[model samples]
Target: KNPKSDKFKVKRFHHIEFWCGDATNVARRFSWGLGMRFSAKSDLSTGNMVHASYLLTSGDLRFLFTAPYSPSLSAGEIKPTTTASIPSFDHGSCRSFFSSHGLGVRAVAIEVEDAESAFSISVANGAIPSSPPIVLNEAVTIAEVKLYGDVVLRYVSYKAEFLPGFERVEDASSFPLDYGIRRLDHAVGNVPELGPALTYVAGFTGFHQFAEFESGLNSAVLASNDEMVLLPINEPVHGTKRKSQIQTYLEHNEGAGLQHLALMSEDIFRTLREMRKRSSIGGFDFMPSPPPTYYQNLKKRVGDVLSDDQIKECEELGILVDRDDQGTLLQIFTKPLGDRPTIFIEIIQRVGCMMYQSGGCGGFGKGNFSELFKSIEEYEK
Candidate 1:
């Protein structure tokens, strides 16, 4: 009955990486507000000697941020000191936007139990590992895995591992304010196709398809195809992976990759409401609240599409779902994490279903989807 130690080795997820057009801007923005101590930037070699990268990490969750050096290059080809082009912004609109939303990109970092093993596994699994797992003076060395790409994921050391470093951080006003950088929460990966990519990563990375769905919220009925698949990868210790959100960026933007990163907030309501004050980036309104009549009718429509326990879990947590004729799905979007609203996040919870929304639930009333559009339509006060 006992499994191989490595087979049962999943413990906790460690860190995540984000690929931004401009790293310096992100670094400056983060340093000014969150006090994220910066690590020396460096270029590392990938296992197969195919691609090269440059990365930066903070000590706590030790999150890594990496990007490609060129279209055709291998690790070690990129010099850490290479200068990079800065991010462009519509100054007039960006300022006006941030003035409106009270929130900012909250947290950023990597997670790891064993830095060496984590990087090692990453290299073994197609990741361009800059460095192998090496013990750091700060924490324990467990089985932390890091997959490097546009947006990345890492197996972190523990829950509280990297948050405290920001305790004494001060803002530009020199006054102690709520340091927005919170814990390194969960992340979602967007790969081409729905199940194939999910299954591939799940198979190779020791990550499982812990959650799935074919519903109204995250489907492509509007496009007439089953294209997007949202999957969550949890390191056994975390217990439950909240509902996930993965849409066709490939379908929308024509590519296979990460859509956004989820930042955990102790206070979701305040976080959502306040962000509206800081930026004009797209966000959500009243947590989708469908009526009892809707719930009562849902069972009859889908004929027990979701189990009683599943329905209870989502409703209690304020999770929402929807769908159309070709297919349906379940998904929840979040307020913007930055000024332009160009990048934001989603909190998705899936159950046995494969779509993010329902196509044929036959209720044009717009469950959560309608609420979101209504909020957007009422954009001007």
Candidate 2:
């Protein structure tokens, strides 16, 4: 209900970039597992001598994976001959980030009205400025600022097709994809404390509080003025017998960072069924479902949005369901993306509410969090 920042403007998420050990391997796995297709590249072959970057996209969702090349390598691509200084981020920064938080998200890019204005206002509002606006093309400019943990917030204003520095892999993917995912629903970030984290974001971005949760961990959701971009910030409650799952995320992620990315789907059943088939052949793993009792009592809790058979299907597929004032949310989470128990993804669909009605359509899974925590606790053991 509160208004966002008056100083600057954020349109929506532009792209998410991850710093990883191998861009090719990570991007391909994302392509096959989630149905994103390779759309562009910035590698040695494409004149990015310091690092390799691969772009993957499905619908409006874009993911960029970047990995730095070793300085010791002899390829002309690896060395810069001139005395000119390259941007610090083009080299050692990527390696240090990857070494600390293996294959983790480093930035979440957003579309702002004027990135120069955005950067200036944010810095004025106590946001630590990273890179000032650098023109990527005559039509585009990108700037960055520090965010929680190693992740940064990127501000950009661009004109279509792709960001300037990369070569396209040719738009369409030859491989058929049927995952049913559309765009980003929300992304969660975990931190050691909830109080200051929420304040910092609001001070910088003017995103107001949208919702909150307290199932072991404290979760406070903040959103853009239009509510198209939602960020749920989580902090652990230390006194519990079983540690908060968010605490576990901070542990393995080495510090607070991106915990989960929720990919929106209009049809969750179709999306889960499609992704499940791929998981059968060794793709990402879905977390184990809640016990039979949860399914048996589903109707008593969530009412009739889902048919009885639909509830049974959710049971089999490990999807969780919850409801708010006028809408129901169906969602599922995957196991951590890599070997560590850190970053993960969620697939969600909100039904039964007019999405046009501000941010109240479907609630975050507050009712389901207790059961979710129990399920993941067993997996941690």
Candidate 3:
């Protein structure tokens, strides 16, 4: 049953907020490893006495790393105009969130045409309210809604540069061009069950179902009206001897939470090459590949889209290849962002969607799941 969610429209993912103990350290992992450019920040130096924040952007893909100052520290007057009210840092709440998740996503911020209706319509339609909308200098507005676990689905109207509370960062960095990691492709959230989670998200936000499939896990993909933002909700399937990876994530995270973020890259070969150079240095480790057997039959399974050299590089770089009727997808998964096995990154490049001139290139590596499973199982070892 498809319900209506027309009160507000999500333009695209605005930014992602990572709640961690050290904003400086966490942001650097991305700036150094993922090649996201350092854009702006809010810290003690900028009079943002309450939190230390770094806004890193790879074109449209923005990640905000924030850590709050201890309560013992003095608080200062914050800017009236800001992208805050939507849960920037709720004092003790954020501290507890970080303690539980340990280097995890706190919120997925989406820019919208109407922040008020997004919040109100969501609340009006069975969605639990986290915080109400706060106007910002008649320029920007923000609000929030309770999502799975401790995370929030943040709604923002617009912004200037980064935000009024943030000071400009005039720092330059290399590798952004080399990696070619562009905007966010999709965000996946893990829940204890699949149906209700999908219903809850699509019911309030009025997002449409994009796709659904499963094996050791069950999933439902929800897409925005324009299909720019795709959020796939997953719940693990139980077995006697083995635990579903989704269950493992919930256990380690202490509850349902963001699982993985698929960041699109213009070229997976170049991106993986550059990421590997700094992998050890920045702590961004890619997972192990399937096996020699998988690569030997790669062309036979996915057809001859990739040349012999391309297939060889994929195996060398540990990239996974999968294709659907829509397009071909070249993807790879990163190890846990930190020590916890909860959240990670997936760098993907779509081939067929562009070849066919449309969306959904490569699809979600469904054909590579069994291979994906054992690779992640090694992490358990």
Candidate 4:
């Protein structure tokens, strides 16, 4: 019973919310390095004193970074002993979140035609409603449901100027850099166990499994019937030589959490070259280079699909390639964004999928997992 056709349609991914201790620095890293511009914000200056949020955008990609702000108290004013000691303090929740997960994805927001109907359907299907649907002013309505690892799936209807409290900010200092990242391709989640997690997602959200794979790691890819949203759930096998990537994420993150965000690109070679140049200038490390053996096997597998020059470019940039019956995929991973080694990004490009089924055929390149795992293991060392 996939409830996405008429009852509730997930139009598209709207934005990803990040809870950070230093919102400004993180936003700067994205603006200068990831080719995003500061679009809007909500802070004391904007009449929002609870927590400060900065919104960044690139084509259709939107990300909101938020951090707790504490005002300086005067001599006569009594300061609360701790955030927890004062339950009424609005910053308590933000303070607690920052302490737990340094700088990571807090919630994933999706666009829907009707937010209230979607909320009602989800709650009636055994999903835990984190917040009831609330209309802001006369324009937007929003609600949330709890997902694994404290991450919330937010339903939002875009009718106003970027959420109620935000004000459009045109900051000339936000030097935009375009690396060809067009939109979010998919988001991967790690859970303690795979079976129950997949069941929960399908049962609550009405998503159906499009593909499933079991090797060293067990993964199931779920997507809406309309093919607008893609989520891959992964869990580590009980016994492995070193610990699977999913196990490492769960161990370091203190529990289940978002694993990575894959961004799509039209020209991945150019985008990767630009990423290399920016990393050289900004001092951000990327994943280890793919080994010669991986490319050697790729050439044999890819045959005449990619020209020698194209293959050489990928080899030099350390990008991995995989081909299926449907099409070919070029992808690369970045090192963990923060010190936690939990969350990161993936850049992908697809070719030969013009007649692909449902507009998406190339799965997450499962054939490239062994090489990818080797690169990630090297980083772990």
- Identify the candidate with maximal lDDT: 3
Better of 1 and 3 by TM-score: 3
TM-score of model number 2: 0.90
Pairs that collide in candidate 3 are: 327-362, 328-362, 329-362
lDDT of 4 by residue, 65-165 (tens): 88777654222333333221111223555666667766788778889887888889988887788777777665788888777786778888856477766
lDDT of each: 0.36, 0.78, 0.80, 0.75
Distance from true location, Cα of 328 in model 2, Å: 1.1
Candidate that beats the other on TM-score, 3 or 4, i.e. the better one: 3
In the predicted model 2, the residue pairs found to clash are 4-206, 5-206
Instruction: Report how far off residue 168 is in candidate 3 (Å).
Output: 1.3
lDDT of 2 at 242: 73
Clash counts per candidate, in order, are 76, 2, 3, 0
Q: Which 10-residue span in candidate 3 carries the lowest summed lDDT?
A: 79-88
Residue 53 error, candidate 3, Å: 1.0
**116-202: candidate 1 lDDT, tens digit per residue:** 554465556655432233222344332322231222333334423222112222234233223233443344444445455444444
Q: Residue 326 of candidate 4: its Cα lDDT? A: 74
Tens-digit lDDT track for model 2 on 90-180? Answer: 5667777887888788888889888888888888898888888766547787888887898888898865556666777754643545477
Q: After TM-score superposition, what is the CA distance of residue 287 in candidate 2 from its true location, in Å?
A: 0.5
